[PDB]
Paper text:
We then iterated on the sequences of two top hits from these libraries (L67R and L67H) by varying the amino acids T12 and T14 simultaneously, which revealed changes that could further increase the HDR-based readout. These included the introduction of negative charge or, in the case of parent L67H, a positively charged histidine at position 14. To understand the molecular basis of the improved activity and binding of the de novo i53 variants identified in our screens, we solved crystal structures of each variant bound to 53BP1 (S2.2, S2.3, S2.4, S2.5 and S2.6). We observed that the L67R change enables a new 2.8 Å H-bond with D1550 of 53BP1, and that L67H forms a network of inter- and intramolecular H-bonds, including a water mediated H-bond to S1554 of 53BP1 and an H-bond to D64 on i53. The intermolecular H-bond to D64 could help lock the i53 loop conformation observed in the crystal structure and lower the entropic penalty for binding. The new interactions identified at position 67 were also present in the crystal structure for T12V.T14H.L67H and T12Y.T14E.L67R. For T12V.T14H.L67H, additional stabilizing interactions were observed at positions T12V and T14H: a water mediated bridge between T14H and Y1502 and Van der Waals contacts between T12V and 53BP1. Interestingly, the T12V mutation alters the polarity of the interface, resulting in displacement of a water molecule and formation of an intermolecular H-bond between D1521 and Y1523 in 53BP1. The T12Y mutation forms additional Van der Waals contacts at the protein-protein interface. These analyses demonstrate that each amino acid change in the variants selected from our screen form stabilizing interactions at the 53BP1 interface, resulting in tighter binding and validating the use of this screening approach to identify gain of function protein variants.Fig. 2 i53 variants display additional molecular interactions with 53BP1.
Author numbering:
A (entry chain A): 1485 to 1603
B (entry chain B): -2 to 74
Amino acid sequence: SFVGLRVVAKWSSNGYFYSGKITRDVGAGKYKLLFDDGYECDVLGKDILLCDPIPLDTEVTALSEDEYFSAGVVKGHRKESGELYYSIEKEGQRKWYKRMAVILSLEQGNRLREQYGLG
Amino acid sequence: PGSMLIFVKTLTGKVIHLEVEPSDTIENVKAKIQDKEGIPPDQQRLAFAGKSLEDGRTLSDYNILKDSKHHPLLRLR
């Protein structure tokens, strides 16, 4: 019932959360996750956020065109034939980012755990 | 120390994060990628925004590192 769901998940204790999909409940409190970036691994359920899309006004980390990740705030989303884009504001300026360009720092993901954490 | 956060995208597409100092050499960064991802440095060609980063320079030599709020994504190729 969690299988097939889109999530944002981290795979290290101090790492970032990345978008992906649950492909199997594998037990020992773990889920096999296929990240949009291609990496697949078994992640602890505590490190999975069941939020898709990431909600309005969430603080995220997004990859700008200049190839720097930096913090911004989600201000909207658009789904264009399968693909999700986020509108993210940084210092007053909104740009559109692909789903896989939007990640969460440990603190940013921790903010979402009570509402969207798996368990 | 004055360490800084960078990201690296591997050939598989997997993104990792590293802590680096502005004084680290590219070889040192490859050694950190090796330590985390097991990718031998002999397999590793790094670039930032499409510019090759060559052994024996530092990140600062390339003007890659800014403030602590902007984390560059290096890409392996």
